[PDB]
């Protein structure tokens, strides 16, 4: 085994925003999901298509790990066939998903008494999101029939809004770090898997 990074995605000092979310293409070693079951209690462990118990023995061509921070009540939105603010505008999951979703609370690390406004998410967009494709933009979203020429104001809003996490928030409004694992196969010979 070469220990291709799983202790880096979960132990990163700084995560990404909802509309950014870092995508890591991990297929380089023998998978060691034993550490996944450890590292604090999990608010959710909802592997789809594959039983969580019988991981650690299955040959996967390419693993995709996506990480971002959201609030608690939106954690249930990271699932196939779900409609919501995060699903329709920030992060979309296909209906034929084969992977896992792991969420854990991060009030101690990702919250400040004054407020953490470094985390952003999109709220308004002309059209919805196709599965697994990003959109980073700052153009003013036209809400009427008068072009604003890139100037905020009436019927012309900025698409990104900040969270503002504070330690005294409730469970549903607390920061939650989410790692989603996506699996797929290709015609290339399988080499990235255990003995």
């Amino acid at each position: 085994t070469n220990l291709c990074p799983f202790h880096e995605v979960f132990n990163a000092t700084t995560f990404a925003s909802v509309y950014a979310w870092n995508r890591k293409r991990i297929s380089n070693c023998v998978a060691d999901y034993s550490v996944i079951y450890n590292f604090a209690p999990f608010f959710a462990f909802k592997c789809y298509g594959v039983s969580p118990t019988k991981l650690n023995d299955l040959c996967f061509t390419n693993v995709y790990a996506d990480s971002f921070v959201i609030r608690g009540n939106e954690v249930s939105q990271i699932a196939p066939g779900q409609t919501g603010n995060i699903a329709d505008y920030n992060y979309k999951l296909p209906d034929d998903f084969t992977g896992c979703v792991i969420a854990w609370n991060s009030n101690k690390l990702d919250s400040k008494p004054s407020g953490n406004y470094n985390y952003l998410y999109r709220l308004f967009r002309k059209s919805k999101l196709k599965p697994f494709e990003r959109d980073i933009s700052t153009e003013i979203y036209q809400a009427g029939n008068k072009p604003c020429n890139g100037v905020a104001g009436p019927n012309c809003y900025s698409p990104l809004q900040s969270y503002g996490f504070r330690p005294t928030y409730g469970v549903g409004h607390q920061p939650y770090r989410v790692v989603v694992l996506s699996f797929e196969l290709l015609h290339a010979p399988a080499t990235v898997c255990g003995p």
């Epitope: 034993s34 079951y37 909802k46 298509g49 039983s51 969580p52 650690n56 196939p80 084969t98």
Partner: antibody
Framework: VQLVESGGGLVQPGGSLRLSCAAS????????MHWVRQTTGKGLEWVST???????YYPDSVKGRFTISREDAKNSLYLQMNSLRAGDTAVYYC??????????????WGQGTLLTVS | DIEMTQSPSSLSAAVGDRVTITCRAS??????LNWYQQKPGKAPKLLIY???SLQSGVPSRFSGSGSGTDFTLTISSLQPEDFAIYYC??????????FGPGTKVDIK
């Protein structure tokens, strides 16, 4: 292959029981075990899950209240129940899980045992 | 959780007839659904996995057909050793597998 349950009886509310399931005819070190309860009307309901490497899974209902553990010395699976309520009255079965690839299922269930509260 | 519903609530037939029971899901589940038999006085037994595959041991008279959301289980010829309750359960979402309410097959 056979699975035999034990631990049935009556308990006052707030009590604790230690139900056991003994499996024979196969290797306990490979397959994974599940506890599934059945009530009249509501139907079957999954209660607990234990796998090969020290992992335990529970529903939202029975969370922070059940402590499923197994010992491979004599091929026995244990389930400890505390702070029992009136809704835990059911018949409990211990089942074995297996998959022919990506598709998972429960192979054998056994006989089952009865639990009631008053 | 993914709810599961079954139809019809009850079914009555004689020996040799063909009986079909349908199972409906709330979300798309692909081919992740399995079939169980609940002969009274005993424990449920596996009949069909992968929503189409025939488990080793069960007679071939049972057939599971479906893809997507709505599935069907059909017994071509009914026999007296079939009075039981049949359940459809999901495997797409783990480890919170959920069962159906079961069906009544009264032999008469």
């Amino acid at each position: 292959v056979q699975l035999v349950e034990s631990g049935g009886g009556l308990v006052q509310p707030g009590g604790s029981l230690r139900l056991s399931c003994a499996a024979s005819g196969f290797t306990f070190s490979s397959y994974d075990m599940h506890w599934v309860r059945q009530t009249t009307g509501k139907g079957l309901e999954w209660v607990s899950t234990i796998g090969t490497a020290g992992d335990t899974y529970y529903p939202d209902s029975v969370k922070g209240r059940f402590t499923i553990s197994r010992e491979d010395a004599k091929n026995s699976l244990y389930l400890q129940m505390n702070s029992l309520r009136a809704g835990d009255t059911a018949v409990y079965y211990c089942a074995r899980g297996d998959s022919s690839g990506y598709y998972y299922y429960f192979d054998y269930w056994g006989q089952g045992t009865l639990l009631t509260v008053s | 959780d993914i709810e599961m519903t079954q139809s019809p609530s009850s079914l009555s037939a004689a020996v040799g007839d063909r009986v079909t029971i349908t199972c409906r899901a709330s979300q798309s589940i692909g081919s992740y659904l399995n079939w169980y038999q609940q002969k009274p006085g005993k424990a449920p037994k596996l009949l069909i996995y992968a929503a189409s595959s025939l488990q080793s041991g069960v007679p071939s008279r049972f057939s599971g057909s479906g893809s997507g959301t709505d599935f069907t289980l059909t017994i071509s010829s009914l026999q007296p050793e079939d009075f039981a309750i049949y359940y459809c359960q999901q495997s797409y979402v783990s480890p919170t597998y959920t069962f159906g309410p079961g069906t009544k097959v009264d032999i008469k």
